[PDB]
From a paper:
The capsaicin- and heat-activated receptor, [name], has served as a model for deciphering lipid modulation, which is relevant to understanding how pro-algesic agents enhance channel activity in the setting of inflammatory pain. Identification of a pocket within the [name] transmembrane core has provided initial clues as to how phosphoinositide lipids bind to and regulate the channel. Here we show that this regulatory pocket in rat [name] can accommodate diverse lipid species, including the inflammatory lipid lysophosphatidic acid, whose actions are determined by their specific modes of binding. We captured several states of [name] ranging from channels in which the VBP is empty to those bearing different bioactive lipids, including distinct phosphoinositide species, brominated phosphoinositide analogs and a pro-algesic lipid, lysophosphatidic acid ([name]). Together, our data show how the VBP accommodates a range of bioactive lipids and how occupancy of the site corresponds to the structural status of the pore.
Author numbering:
A (entry chain A): 384 to 456, 460 to 603, 627 to 712
B (entry chain B): 385 to 456, 461 to 463, 467 to 603, 627 to 683, 688 to 712
C (entry chain C): 392 to 457, 461 to 603, 627 to 712
D (entry chain D): 385 to 603, 627 to 712
């Protein structure tokens, strides 16, 4: 394995895996049979166990964080002499520890790899997500000690993001790894396109309705936007208010909006999701292989 | 040579504007020199021009939305000056769109049978303009239907932003895909559903005795409620022979679901490579429009 | 006496390759020629007349009073009664045509409910119209139910005339094929699951509004249309069992609805394009034969 | 020779009851002599025998349903038998249903012992046997609780009733369309529903915990309440305003919008598409698995004389 796994300066694994999202063929090169076998071998040797241990630790940490937050009480609040309070505060100090740990992990990531500042928002989505969670937790701490009530919003954002972050650990399993890859591809392509078009349609139709509406609760653009959105989730009322003239034009706008959005653009989202799944099978598999390779190399460098 | 600018007739000019009846409108655009020259001219000036046009139109739509939203007819404050200037600007923009629509109609003189198959965006812009002008006429005649004509114009204007996707590739292809369903499998797939809905609404309203759902409008709307995930199944109790009522409702629900299902199996039984060709064709049309319009 | 065009078009379903034999150059050419010459214009007129009949019947049914009822001498009421008379004449005509078809083509009891779908639909709508009349003259009230059933089947049979245009005829062919193939199995399995979970839930419920098998079944089915409640009763014991059962039913019913909405595409993303077009061609050929035999 | 009539080690029986590990236990049965033999024996006697079994099963399940739905509701079981024709019918229906439960329990115990399975693929293969054993176990524990003077006999009975009513799909085999429909159902539950449910449960628990943390207190201060409220979206009955006993409406609505966009918009339509590809990919596999299931039915009946 000369210049294959350990050169300490520049070797094939480090350049292939850590190459930025610019190389034309950064995915199919790992499919070389000896290299595939080598990665799988190192995995089975120790990386599988280290990843399982890390996953168990992360799940336990997030359970602790959920327990501490779910029982949250002008902070800070006095530490009452009761077992529940001691356990709550001990959970809080563990959560803060996790946040600071991820804050340093992201810093070390960005310093050791030092992306070119351009493809920093094109790859390494997991690391930026973890850094953002860490920042949310830190800002929650800062507001908590500053005697403000926005620390709840900060930490709930942190908690939701951290819970959704367990998708990171789906890698290391063939089936769930490919599933997570497909989810991410679909988010990037189909969700984005449909969301842009649908946002334009919804804003236009809500503006038309609110202009028609004379006064009342839905005279606000926000109220009318919420009402028109409630159609896409199978909850459209179609008669939320009668405070306006010319029932005809109101119903015409509502029916045109429903036909163009609910029956046409949703059917279009589903169809693109079908086409993509039928198209990017092997691409998803290669991306999963590369994700596992990056994890293996990192944990190998972590001793 | 006589392909880019002949000043009398060029291949790009004739291929761009050849009617829909021609068999291979977008296929021959794939010729190497045509593709390369179209791309060269686009990336030379049309991209910048199109970006500027899209920005101007978006700003205009924001202005018109603000003016219409804060409507106090007909009808010394900074807010009052902003509203009135917004109204004036919106009217002027509608007039300009009227002008451009008339100009295109006269120039291409479509055959009134593909006039609707082609120039879909042009027809949409013209109809927007006709709504705005009628809204002006009603407003200055001391009437109220100006609000209906304004809201329709505003809705079409905001939903017409999709014409500007051309210039962004993936957004252009997605927009081309939506166009296909509306101008091919929308009328046809909607006539069947409409006849089902009308027939079952007539059956139900006949079955009812009397109530707040005596009219055809209310019963038709109730039967439509199911299509939007709001099936009530009990809206009226004033009747006789409950079993016939409920079995008819179940029949309608199952049939409408199967109809939607057949819609999906039919249309999902798209193009991908043809859509890219369509988008390239529309981008080329934009390129020549910018070139001649300078 | 015996022509390949009339023999094959009316050939049984026992023949293997009807959908193919219409591809023969002379046959398809001649069928298109006859259509475009005369049968297109005859079919257009026939569709016009049928739609006018349906409008008349709809108007008559809508304004029904609240039998027989006395006629008050007003022009609108004379209009109503003559509408009802035209509606009965058309129903009788459809009944006569159905009986004539059954006494001419003698369907051999095997594909009788597989092919000739439109003819059977019209015949059953005739059986509804005539039984409605019989109830009406007998001083009975069920005539309203029979009449509404007939009206629903008529407006739905409107689709029979969708043929003569390729795209709409092919979509209608897809609807018929779906109804005869896939909704069958989907509804069998869905009914089994719905009844099982309905019985479980109603057994769990002690008493109340939703204590009957019928009300429980309705509340359960309400989930398939995205109008679930998940809390429609509380007069019982073991809320845990209630929630477990409702969650299991919701999960399984979505599995089933999905499995269908996918399996139909998976099986027939392919055959629809060509087989449905061939079937539409066959249906147009049969229409040509019927029109010609009607002179 | 020694294909189906060997009595020492027959290839047909060996392959039909073979280990799961066998690479192509489904493909080998397609051999023309094997398939011809299976079809012959089926048509000759197993068709009639299996249809009679289906009829008896349906009759048993109707009797049990009628007995349960008409149960006496008075508390503290058992209940004294009151002299009435209807009551005599309702108690004999009960005693027949109990007998059926015991019969299925013994059938399962027999399959378990006779087969001597691997204890590793035992769950992976033979889902039907374990499911029937489970309904029988529920029924027997329902009898025990009924005699033990408790109120959980009804819970055990309703679970058994639901499981048995859904178990009629075991008989879908023997009809090509519904057999292949059931096998596709089974594959799709094992793969696509499992993946989607893993991701969806993670997402739902995370966002529901976040919301219930945000919610100050009131009706929805319980984790279960917020979990149900969030699950109401995926069934197409979300509210978006079910609670207002909190602060910072901005964060609340942002969390709800994120949850909706991530689950309802994205993961459900991904389920659509993934199930589309799957079904478009695994047709012949389902056909072969159904053929093997009918083969196992035929062999079991033949050994049952
Ligand atoms: C902030 C917004 C982020 C939005 C991005 C979408 C979420 C998804 O990010 O990426 C999935 C996963 C993988 O990332 P990775 O960098 O490690 O992989 C990359 C990746 O494959 C890429 O092709 C190559 O660069 C190379 O293959 C490999 O290097 O990352 C996760 O673990 C998050 C998944 C869990 C979060 C999903 C929630 C939805 C995302 C939007 C909301 C985010 C906040 C919650
Ligand atoms: C432990 C619990 C795991 C639950 C997973 C779901 C199991 C399931 O669903 O498989 C239906 C089953 C028939 O599999 P089979 O054993 O016959 O198939 C196998 C299989 O194919 C194998 O590959 C071949 O070796 C060969 O074919 C054969 O070995 O049972 C039925 O006959 C349908 C009955 C359908 C009802 C069962 C599902 C009900 C869901 C919950 C119901 C809630 C009720 C309350
Ligand atoms: C009075 C009768 C009702 C008239 C319609 C009222 C105005 C509501 C909006 C009508 C929707 C028309 C269809 C539409 O606006 O979407 C199509 C475009 O996105 C397609 O993209 P593009 O314009 O071709 O570039
Ligand atoms: C005999 C039981 C009591 C009467 C209840 C009957 C419930 C049916 C209600 C009438 C509508 C049935 C129409 C139908 O069966 O679905 C649509 C047609 O298939 C479409 O076929 P086609 O296009 O007309 O050829
Ligand atoms: Na709903
Ligand atoms: Na719904």
């Amino acid at each position: 394995l000369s210049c294959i796994d350990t050169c300490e300066k520049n070797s094939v694994l480090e350049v292939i895996a850590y190459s930025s999202s610019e190389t034309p063929n950064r995915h199919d090169m790992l499919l070389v049979e000896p290299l595939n076998r080598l990665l799988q071998d190192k995995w089975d040797r120790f990386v599988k166990r280290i990843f399982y241990f890390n996953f168990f630790v992360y799940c336990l940490y997030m359970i602790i964080f959920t327990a501490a937050a779910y029982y949250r009480p002008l902070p800070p609040y006095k530490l009452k002499n009761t077992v529940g309070d001691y356990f709550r505060v001990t959970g809080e100090i563990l959560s803060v520890s996790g946040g600071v740990y991820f804050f340093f992990r992201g810093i070390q990531y960005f310093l050791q790899r030092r992306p070119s500042l351009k493809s920093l928002f094109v790859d390494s989505y997991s690391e930026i997500l973890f850094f953002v969670q860490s920042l949310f937790m830190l800002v929650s701490v800062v507001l908590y000690f500053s005697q403000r009530k926005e620390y709840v919003a900060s930490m709930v954002f942190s908690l939701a993001m951290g819970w959704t972050n367990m998708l990171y650990y789906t890698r290391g399993f063939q089936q769930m790894g490919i599933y997570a890859v497909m989810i991410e591809k679909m988010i990037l392509r189909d969700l984005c396109r449909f969301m842009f078009v649908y946002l334009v349609f919804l804003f236009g139709f809500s503006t038309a309705v609110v202009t028609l509406i004379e006064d009342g609760k839905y005279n606000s653009l926000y109220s009318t936007c919420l009402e028109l959105f409630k159609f896409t989730i199978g909850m459209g009322d179609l008669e939320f208010t009668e405070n306006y003239d010319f029932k005809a034009v109101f119903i015409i706008l509502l029916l045109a909006y429903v036909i163009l959005t609910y029956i046409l653009l949703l059917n279009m989202l589903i169809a693109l999701m079908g086409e993509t799944v039928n198209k990017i099978a092997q691409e998803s598999k290669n991306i999963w292989k590369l994700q596992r390779a990056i994890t293996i190399l990192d944990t190998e460098k972590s001793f």
